[model samples]
Target: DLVQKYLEKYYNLKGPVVEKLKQMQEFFGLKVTGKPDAETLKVMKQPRCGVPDVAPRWEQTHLTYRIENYTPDLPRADVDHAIEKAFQLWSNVTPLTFTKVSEGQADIMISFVRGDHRDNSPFDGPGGNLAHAFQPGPGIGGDAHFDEDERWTNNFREYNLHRVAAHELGHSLGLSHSTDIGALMYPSYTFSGDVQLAQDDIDGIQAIYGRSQNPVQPIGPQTPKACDSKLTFDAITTIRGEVMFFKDRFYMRTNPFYPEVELNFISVFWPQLPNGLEAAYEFADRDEVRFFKGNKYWAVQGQNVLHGYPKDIYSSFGFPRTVKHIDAALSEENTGKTYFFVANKYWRYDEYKRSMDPGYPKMIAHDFPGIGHKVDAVFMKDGFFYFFHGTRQYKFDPKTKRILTLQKANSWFNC
Candidate 1:
């Protein structure tokens, strides 16, 4: 049992990344094992650098660096030599040049920090995060911070400062982790010795900074493609304070406070919650989330499906026989009205009186001037009504009855 701990910690296996496993474990930490128990260890075994590989490349060739502080694990001279050599590895392959500066903040500032260092990304002790660096940008951008808790050595016997720093520097230079195992930018630091830039590493850094004056002008592929800007949504609603967006089999959840957007299939959260939900909205008064699909609807209470749900929409919501299905739904707490859309018309339910409004089924174009004949989804936030029509969403001004902004439906996903 004791020996197993070191084996799990230092085996340096590839494939499943420890950072990925670290994230998975933490993501499901509530129900799963410890930070890295055997149950979760197989989830991922990444032992690479902690910096995310995707970052903007350095625009300029000339860059300066500064050792903000030296680690007590190694001598000042050793740290200096290792850091300088790490930068040189990339400089050898690309047009990049590293200049060492003293007394002030440089383009890439190097430091040995443990735990929370004022940055949002914190180090979890010594074992999980060896080192991390930011992408090329301003402020904390292009800065490399090593975990001081680890035994920063110079050789392969233990964690080497040069190897880890070299990988972190790749991030600072705007090069992400290459899937090529032979590449230096490959997320984890397993290979050791006098750090040599592999061919893939050379190709990646050169793709960003161009190659050295070696005369071989081989052409490389174009830049990486970005996220598809034309993504659309199936349904969107505010559930449990998070804006949950639906798109066919999968859905994405994002909150104002959360750092990253989470995308997952419907089955992962609740298998009973079927795919391609037509509409969803939260009733703050009853603390219930209602999901509509065709003629039936499901009322979920805090991630749990309520009893006798998936009920007849027309019967439960007091909709007429003509209003068989719902295309979009949302509740305006301020107005004490719940709006339901079907075909080109929309029906309003009075929240305060608990009854459908008599003068109802109004044309969408008449009620909301900018809204198209059909609305795919709708949500209310900060006194503004966001209406979705196909791939376009209109940030509408309820008071003025006009569209304030025209944004892509995918923009809700932070596209």
Candidate 2:
């Protein structure tokens, strides 16, 4: 915990980092001190990127790239495809357009060179320093160099060529290491399925070059949704009067008062909650945000976990074991009733009754009307219930049992 806090707070800085080291020393039975003694310094000195965590981005929108050389481990076509896909990852999310050049001097240069590669940045053989890229600028800037000593492959089984290139190219595009551990720009690399950009990755690149004319689709492969919306939300809820839309590990905060809305990783504020949520709700009476993932649920208020929580959903709330994961949850302020949707069924919980109303786990279409059998998310704003499934969203009138309108999910984001 101490080491993690140090890295997170200072990003491995040696100056002010000493302050945290003093606290660690005191806790570890050493004499309190301002400077990190030899014992602490040894543990802190781990190999890291030669590049700075943050830097200036490229000024030009259109950039040219060229692969000067290739690794013998993978086919030349695979290398070409990997680099193209890697560049597309960033270009899909930002205004930046990367063009490939054969012989001319390109803004970005790609190559696999062993040991000292002529540049000031040198590769450290097979394991250490897999690849590095110069930040955007002139000369060697925006150039990505991979260590030829290491075996590179396209699959997730080994040092994935596409994944590493995607990460290094992020630096080439002038993005800094993100504090978000799930972000593609995070310094250390761990293969998490297919190389998909997290919300943090998109926000970082967009900050540098602005949103692309056609932003890349969601990270990782998926069965294409029928609707053509990019903003896919997992859960929706209102907290302190702001509508929060969640997708996987990230959420977007939208305030009518403030015109600007931004994507944020949920872990930044609610560290206890995991990346994906099955359901979520702001229990107004309890003054807490309840998040559900898998079988367990956590109640949080102001960054602090409400005592004795992360309780089992079924055990604590009398939900049946048959329901393993909840799809969405919402608290209707007018009726003081909370709804939990799972699969194609929905359940109602009466706060006053302090129990679920009998004969629930009802078909969502019966009461909701017009939405599909299952709901992806549900929320009440003003006086209406909004049901979301896939890329389509429906506004329903509970009192009149009428469907107000059907629209693409992008409408909610004002895209």
Candidate 3:
């Protein structure tokens, strides 16, 4: 984790961390010798920025910030003013604007805490990391957390809140720690008077957010990414005890021996299968797995598609006139009975009858108390039901007919 060695902590950036680290070669040894040796070890201990070295930029231009809490070392007024001025530094050069909010969920939230704050990147008393922040996305994204362990002040002496806040806010806005010591986004802390944005800082920020004259609100995908907060699953199923989760074109798999989640392409397994899959299910009786997309379905076994597959959903299964496409499918472990979802309604199909159950097409919310949103995907694992929608994952216990917990669907990806 050379990025961690240079940045002080692994922030779990979305893209290749080392590839990004290769560019920020300071504390990260840039050896022409091809491999790391003793030189890398010595530089790893050097003081570096607490935030990740690489991150994506926020799409929005007009942003809001909130001082969630203030440090006891400084007056509340000073803390608020210091944070306000920090945003001003970036906003002045770019079209991005920031408004202070005391309530509601703002784009950025500032908090003060010491020791373990549950963010994994915890503060170690004083003289370690002054503070840390996240890049733009959702929830904890764009949030800056100051270390309460440090003696915070607005003046030149002691860790200046204004100077530190300005530097950290650069991260919150998507500027990575610069190798240029003259830049405010430099990993190491430098204290003097009021912090000024250096040429490197100005150019770097303008590169992402654009120039102030343009006032371009950077456009990007509104949807949360796999490594992003509140990430939703496109589809989920167990491909022979190897549970797999699909998002866009990629599928994430988990193994007992291999603790890390395996991220691969859907085409790797089923070359014919397209992205944005609607539903996937497999029964105990057969080795082949079924996939639903648009008006067609596919019967696939291993990497090969069955001889006569990609059939019509309406003719074979005899779905309702109202139901054209399926949202999700979950087959029971013991009975092998399957449930197909569409919109908020679900229809049970009995294997014995070889037809849709008579008393069927009930509201998913009524049938399953825990599930609220129209299920994007659902699957049964070890008797429990996992329902996914948007960025939320619901774990349901059939016996209790209640939700055990609500969590991010991407947690399955270990992101």
TM-score of each: 0.49, 0.51, 0.47
Model 2: per-residue Cα lDDT over 330-401, one tens digit each: 998867789999998889998777789889878887887778788888888877888888777788888897
Candidate with top TM-score is 2
Q: Write the number of the candidate with greater TM-score, choosing between 1 and 2.
A: 2
lDDT assessment of candidate 1? 0.72
Flag regions of model 2 displaced more than 4 Å: 1-182, 186-228, 255-260
* lDDT, model 2, position 356: 91
Better of 1 and 2 by lDDT: 2
Candidate 2 lowest-lDDT run of ten? 219-228
Q: In candidate 2, residue 155 scores what lDDT?
A: 76
Go through the candidates in order and give the clash count of each.
6, 1, 0
Candidate 3 residue 139 C-alpha distance from true site, Å? 51
Q: Tell me model 2's lDDT, rounded to 2 decimals.
A: 0.74
